[PDB]
Amino acid sequence: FEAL
Amino acid sequence: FEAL
Amino acid sequence: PQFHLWKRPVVTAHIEGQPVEVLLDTGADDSIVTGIELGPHYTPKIVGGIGGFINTKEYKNVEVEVLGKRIKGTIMTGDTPINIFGRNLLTALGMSLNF
Amino acid sequence: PQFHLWKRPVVTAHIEGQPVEVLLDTGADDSIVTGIELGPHYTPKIVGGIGGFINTKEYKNVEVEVLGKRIKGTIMTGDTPINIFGRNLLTALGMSLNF
Question: How is this protein organized at the quaternary level (chains C, D)?
């Protein structure tokens, strides 16, 4: 999981 | 993503 | 059925009756949820992610209802930015990553 | 073909000739790699994950060779604990999450  |  | 990955693979699950929207994550080994309470029978844990790590409460044999099935499995609670179901629950749901 | 999710879905990719082992992550929107250099034509970025966030260098139209295909796409470099290919490259590879 990762995002901005 | 995650783990230990 | 399948999720195509143009949008995030989000579904609604019920963790002990509580509705929660979860992201199905193949890169998470564990599933960690927030904003649900599952009680005092937990072991504390720390899981790492991209920017560092968090304190979680690991619960065993919790019941999860999602995509037509009821399975019991391990849920952690902690301050995650988004709720995730990792490979421990996705293997229980017979999900594979196909190409 | 497919990955069953009992083990991590790891493959080797070549990013501009460089071999790198990457985790295919359906919960990553972006792909971020470390220990490769792709040069000075980048825009800086911050991406969040579980424990906080990191500084990355976003590169566009990088060439990636993985699972029999050459595709060009967006790679970021930053201090990730594990290299991940997120949904931007998995959609390019025709991967879906099936059950």
Answer: Homodimer. The active site consists of two apposed aspartic acid residues.
CA-nearest of D30, D40, D31 to D13 is D31
Fold assignment, C1-99: Cathepsin D, subunit A; domain 1 (2.40.70)
3-state secondary structure of D27: coil
Q: Which pair of structure tokens corresponds to residue C93? A: 């749901």
C48 φψ region: left (φ > 0), alpha (ψ -120 to 50), beta (else)? beta
Resolution in A: 2.5
CA distance C39 to chain A (A): 26
Please measure the distance between the N-terminal and C-terminal CA atoms of chain A and give it in whole angstroms. Answer: 11
Query: C25 and A1 in contact by Cβ < 8 A?
Result: yes
Q: How many CA atoms lie within 13 A of C94 on its CB side?
A: 7
Q: Which approach determined this entry?
A: X-ray
**Chain A interface test: which of D22, D23, D29, D85 (most A C-beta within 10 Å):** D29
User: What distance in Å separates the CA atoms of residue D85 and residue D23, rounded to the nearest whole number?
Assistant: 6
Q: In chain C, where are the structural domains located? A: 1-99
Q: Nearest CA of chain B to the CA of A1: how many Å?
A: 4
